[PDB]
Amino acid sequence: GAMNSSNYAELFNNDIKLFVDDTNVYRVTVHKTFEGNVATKAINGCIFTLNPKTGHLFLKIIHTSVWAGQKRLSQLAKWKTAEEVSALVRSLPKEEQPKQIIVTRKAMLDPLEVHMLDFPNIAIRPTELRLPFSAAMSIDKLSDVVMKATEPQMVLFNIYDDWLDRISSYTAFSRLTLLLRALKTNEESAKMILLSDPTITIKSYHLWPSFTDEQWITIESQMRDLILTEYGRKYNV
Amino acid sequence: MNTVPFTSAPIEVTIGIDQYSFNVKENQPFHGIKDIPIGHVHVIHFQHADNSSMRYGYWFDCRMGNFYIQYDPKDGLYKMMEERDGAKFENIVHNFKERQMMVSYPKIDEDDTWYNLTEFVQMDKIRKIVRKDENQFSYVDSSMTTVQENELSDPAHSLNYTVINFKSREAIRPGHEMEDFLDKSYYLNTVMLQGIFKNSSNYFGELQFAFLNAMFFGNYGSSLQWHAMIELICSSATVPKHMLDKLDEILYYQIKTLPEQYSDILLNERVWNICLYSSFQKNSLHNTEKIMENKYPELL
């Protein structure tokens, strides 16, 4: 069934599962033509497939060539996502294949379900959570490798850096979603907060700065404050 | 013109023949239905005045033998049986007419309704969906489940309709996932028409039998099968023109014939709005669209 606040801890049990987010698969700019009509120009996109227990991220880069000569691209994007997720599952050894795939938007259920017919024992679930995974392209290194790609490419990351050496999955996921929530609500502030102090650097093999434990507490609170402020502004409360 | 005599009518029951029906009172001297039009399948059905649950009935074709109804006080229901003694049977039938204890199949000569509802229904195919090969007629009731329903318990009582499933390996060719799911033409024409049904008339026959079971018995799995077979056609971009034209006629007489008060459980909102307004074949059901609109605009 659907994923929500009730069954939220199932994400951190030992059943292998992946989140799939397709929000950044088909990305365009919108511009005016010489005659004054509107046109779109596609840019590179990505599928965000994430194991929330381990932090492993399977960043499937979607090169603009994929769209060439295709109609109804926003519909095609859902099927391409499902196609690439299915290929990812096929490429993994049996004991690594997930038991569940949770799609962050319900439009992906039928495409993925159809692409996964060869895996009848993998459950394709929707979710009621409002996960902020669209802000993945606010992580500088993720956006950089997507924008520079010259061909379809899969790039693997751990989206938790080394946090699990000191905290649980539950807490790691909560930190990630708080950072992404903030990046989504006010990217400029969020990034300011993360980088203000030039003495805290990002390891070449990491995505986020190497904060100490105390510094993560300050950061998380700064991200919390950011998010609540933006709410009052949005709604005049 | 053929006859189906009744040994007696011991319990108060509403009797249907095809789309007609009569109230018969406990121990009323009712002894059968005469003038039944030869050349079509037929269905005789029942609803006890005491259990408005469980409509049941028998599909038959008089060319396949001499059939009669008899109440069974052990099993508690009107049973169809076959009389193998041709002489003994004409004797019972002639005597009952003489005594004029039989109702006349009440066909208006202008009326092709039953023909239109049963055009492609052949007894031989019914007996493959309702497998009970010692009888030439087929029993169906409200409660019977379909093979597909069982999968998701007693297989002897099953409606062995053809399983249609849009999210199956059967429906979907590898590498044509998106194509075959958005355009079911492959599934319709290669897998089902050429593969399983062999021709369109057998397909339409199953579609029609499914509708009549839903209508006469409220069999919910038959309603599901009927909508599935419609949706499969309507969700295919490439359908023989002769099938589209016939489908509009088929659906027209089905919609025309449905009791007005049952549209809610018998008509699936999604499938119809999809077929009539979203599908490839939106523009090909002009008669069925006109009558749906003028009769059940609520559902749409």
State whether residue B152 sits within 8 Å of chain A by CB: no
Do A24 and A128 belong together in one domain?
A: yes
B172 touches chain A (CB under 8 A): yes
Structural domain contains residue A1: no
Resolution of this structure in Å = 1.8
Say if residue A41 is in the same domain as residue A86: yes
Last residue of a domain, one of A163, A194, A223: A163
- B177 in A contact zone (CB under 8 Å): yes
The phi, psi pair for B239, rounded to 5°, reads -125, 130
| Preferred mutation among B173, B176, B179, B181 to probe A, highest tally of A CBs within 10 A | B181
> Do A46 and A148 sit in the same domain of this protein?
yes
Q: Do A148 and A171 belong together in one domain?
A: no
- Identify the residue whose tokens are 């033509």: A33
Chains A, B: CB contacts within 8 A come to: 21
Q: Is B181 on the interface with A (CB under 8 A)?
A: yes
For residue B139, give the 3-state DSSP assignment: strand
In a domain, A192, yes or no: yes
Residue with tokens 């049977």: B89
Do A47 and A151 reside in the same domain of the chain? yes
Q: Domains of chain B by range and CATH?
A: 1-143 (2.60.34.20), 144-300 (1.25.40.550)
Q: How far is A183 from chain B (nearest CA, A)?
A: 34
Same-domain pairing of A86 and A181: no
Query: In angstroms, rounded to a whole number, what is the distance separating the alpha carbons of residues B5 and B67?
Result: 8
User: Residue B191: how many CA atoms within 13 Å on its side-chain side?
Assistant: 20
Same domain, A68 and A148: yes
Residue B181 has its nearest CB partner, among A83, A114, A118, at A114
Q: Which residues in B92-113 are b (16+ Cβ under 10 Å) and which e?
A: bbeebbeeebbbebebeeeeee
A53 belongs to a structural domain: yes
Beta-strand (E) ranges in A22-149?
27-32, 38-43, 45-50, 56-62, 100-103, 123-125
CB-based contact A114 B168, cutoff 8 Å: no
Last residue of a domain, one of A129, A146, A163: A163
CA distance A115 to chain B (A): 7
Q: How far is A13 from chain B (nearest CA, A)?
A: 28
B268-273 contacts at long range (C-beta below 8 A, 24 or more positions apart): B268/B223, B268/B227, B269/B299, B269/B300, B271/B227, B271/B230, B271/B231, B272/B299, B272/B300, B273/B299, B273/B300
A96 and A68: one domain?
Answer: yes
Angstroms from B291 CA to nearest CA on chain A: 32
Of B167, B169, B178, which is closest to A113 when you measure between CB atoms? B167
Q: In what order do the strands lie in the sheet with B13-17?
A: B20-24, B13-17, B42-48, B56-60, B138-141
State which amino acid sits at residue B157. Answer: H
Q: Give B-chain residues touching A76 at CB under 8 angstroms.
A: 178
**Phi and psi angles of residue B272, each rounded to the nearest 5 degrees, phi first:** -70, -50
Residues A227 and A121 occupy one common structural domain: no
Name the closest residue on chain A to residue B171, using Cα atoms. Answer: A114
Q: Long-range CB contacts (< 8 A, 24+ apart) of A36-40? A: none
Residue A2 lies in a domain: no
**CATH number, position A235:** 1.20.80.40
CA angle, A216 as apex, A215 and A222 as ends, to 5°? 95
Query: Looking at chain A from residue 139 to 168, which residues have their Cβ under 8 Å from any Cβ of chain B?
Result: none
B172/A83 CB distance under 8 A: no
Q: In the structure encoding, which two tokens stand for residue B5, read together?
A: 């005599």
Domain range for A58: 9-163
* Residues A71 and A137 placed together within one structural domain of the fold: yes
Domain membership flag for residue A172: yes
Q: Coil, helix or strand for B226?
A: helix
Q: What are phi and psi of A229, to 5 degrees?
A: -50, -55
Contact call for residues B12 and B26 (beta carbons, < 8 A): yes
Residue B201 and residue A121: Cα distance in Å, rounded? 38
Contacts with B270 from chain A: Cβ below 8 Å: none
Quick one: angle between helices A213-235 and A169-185, nearest 10? 40
The verdict on residue A211 lying in a domain is: yes
Check residue B11 and report its DSSP letter: S
Rounded Cα distance between B257 and B215, Å, is: 9
Question: In this complex, is the C-beta atom of A60 within 8 Å of any C-beta atom belonging to chain B?
Answer: no
Query: B168 and A82 in contact by Cβ < 8 A?
Result: no
Domain end point (choices A123, A139, A163): A163
Q: Could you tell me the CATH number of the domain that includes residue A140?
A: 3.30.420.230
Same domain, A137 and A213: no
| Domain identity same for A185 and A152 | no
Tally of structural domains, chain A: 2
